[PDB]
Amino acid sequence: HHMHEIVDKNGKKVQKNNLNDEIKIIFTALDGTLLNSENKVSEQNLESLIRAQEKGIKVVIATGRSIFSVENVIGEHVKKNRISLLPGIYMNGCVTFDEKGSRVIDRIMNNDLKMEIHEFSKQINISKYAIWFCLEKTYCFEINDCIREYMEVEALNPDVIEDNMLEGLTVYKVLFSLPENILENTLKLCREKFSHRINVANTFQSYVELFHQHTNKFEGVKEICKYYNISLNNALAMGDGENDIEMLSGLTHSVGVHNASEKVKNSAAYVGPSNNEHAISHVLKTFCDI
Numbered sequence: 439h440h441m442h443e444i445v446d447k448n449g450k451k452v453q454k455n456n457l458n459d460e461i462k463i464i465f466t467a468l469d470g471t472l473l474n475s476e477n478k479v480s481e482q483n484l485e486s487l488i489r490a491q492e493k494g495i496k497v498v499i500a501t502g503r504s505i506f507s508v509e510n511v512i513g514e515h516v517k518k519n520r521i522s523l524l525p526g527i528y529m530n531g532c533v534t535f536d537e538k539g540s541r542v543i544d545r546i547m548n549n550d551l552k553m554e555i556h557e558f559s560k561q562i563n564i565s566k567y568a569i570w571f572c573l574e575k576t577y578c579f580e581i582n583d584c585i586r587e588y589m590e591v592e593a594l595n596p597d598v599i600e601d602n603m604l605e606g607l608t609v610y611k612v613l614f615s616l617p618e619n620i621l622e623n624t625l626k627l628c629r630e631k632f633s634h635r636i637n638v639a640n641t642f643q644s645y646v647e648l649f650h651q652h653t654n655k656f657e658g659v660k661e662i663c664k665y666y667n668i669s670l671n672n673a674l675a676m677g678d679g680e681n682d683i684e685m686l687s688g689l690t691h692s693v694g695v696h697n698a699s700e701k702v703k704n705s706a707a708y709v710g711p712s713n714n715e716h717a718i719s720h721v722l723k724t725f726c727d728i
């Protein structure tokens with residue numbers, strides 16, 4: 439079966455003996471890539487991560503999430519030092535930490551643009567689906583089934599605040615947890631309204647994330663590779679979503695998981711197993727020989 443293979447754009451399996459780059463570091467999206475559909479790290483994945491640590495391969499999270507919500511989802515692995523959060527690429531790069539927890543990227547959203555996005559979202563009535571991200575906390579204006587759905591997966595609850603409090607907050611992104619029935623339209627509105635102002639990404643299901651226009655996960659990738667004197671040619675990125683496109687296309691070695699869209703897969707060098715098929719275990723096998 440093809441359940442566990444990694445293939446190039448011609449459908450040919452990638453073989454270790456044909457590689458000419460040692461992979462020293464792997465950057466991976468969390469939900470939809472490392473985590474299976476149940477938001478868990480599979481045992482096969484965990485077993486391969488243990489071996490990657492024994493061999494000195496670095497595994498770095500690159501996510502739209504804050505580090506706080508990551509810790510709530512995979513904390514048990516973090517506590518056992520099996521997955522490191524530092525260094526890490528959070529909020530789609532806008533908050534990227536080195537191993538000392540210093541922000542090597544800190545891309546706050548301009549406050550005029552914040553308020554314009556806010557007023558626009560109230561105008562088109564998606565403000566109720568908004569989760570605003572400060573450095574250390576998230577905020578929403580009300581709770582509904584869509585906010586509920588976001589809390590369940592994110593596993594970290596926003597504080598509920600009044601509308602007029604937003605002006606005082608220093609934010610890095612906003613995430614709209616949208617009903618499925620208005621995703622496609624709302625995405626068109628935001629992209630038309632804020633082109634060359636803000637990144638707009640459909641990252642996961644009906645999530646729409648807006649963050650610093652000149653920042654993405656790949657900017658974080660470059661910073662962390664730089665920190666450890668690792669050429670980009672010895673890095674590998676894997677992902678599934680729109681917010682992974684820049685890091686998949688920016689590295690010579692990248693893997694789009696099988697569950698990714700055709701757009702995301704096209705941006706990647708290789709296509710691997712789905713997130714439910716232990717994608718990073720097979721990546722580690724193919725590229726690092728376990």
Ligand SMILES: O=C[C@H](O)COP(=O)(O)O
Nearest residue numbers: 467468469501502641642
């Ligand atoms: O809520 C989860 C995120 O939208 C997906 O996270 P990721 O960037 O690690 O795939």
Ligand SMILES: [Mg+2]
Nearest residue numbers: 467469470679
């Ligand atoms: Mg993802």
